[PDB]
C-alpha cells in the first residue's frame, strides 16, 4: 500500500514495472521528466522514489539535493546499467539508500522494493 514515484528511461520497464507494483497493491505515480519528478516529490510524501542516474533534464543528484531543502533523507533507489552507476557511486552512496543493477527482473525488482519497505536492502 506504499506509494512511489518511478522516473524510468526504459519505456517497457516504466510500463510494466509500473503495472506488476499495482498488481502488489503500491500506488505509482510514473513520470517522464525530471522537473515533474521533482514538484510531485515536493507536493506529495512517497514511501520510495525510483530513479536511474541521469533523469534526463537533470541528474539524480541534483533531484536529490533540490528535494533535500525541504525533504531531507527522503527515500530515494537508483536502477541503472553497471556503468553509470560505478561512475557516479561514491555520489549515489551520499543520497540513495540502495541502488540495483540492470538488468533485471521485473519479479526481482519488485522483490527489492518489497524489501527495502522492510527494512531489508537485499531478497
Known sequence: GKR??????????????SLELQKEQ??????????????????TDYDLILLNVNLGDMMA???????????????IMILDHWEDLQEELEVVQRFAVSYIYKPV???????????????????
Open 26 to 43: 503500491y500506488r505509482v505515480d510514473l513520470v517522464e521528466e525530471g522537473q515533474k519528478a521533482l514538484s510531485m516529490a515536493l507536493q
Open 105 to 123: 527482473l521485473i519479479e526481482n525488482l519488485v522483490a527489492r522494493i518489497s524489501a527495502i519497505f522492510r527494512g531489508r536492502d537485499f531478497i
Open 61 to 75: 543528484q541534483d533531484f536529490a539535493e533540490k528535494l533535500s531543502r525541504t525533504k531531507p533523507a527522503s527515500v
Open 4 to 17: 512511489i514515484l518511478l522516473l524510468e528511461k526504459e519505456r517497457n520497464l516504466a510500463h510494466f514495472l
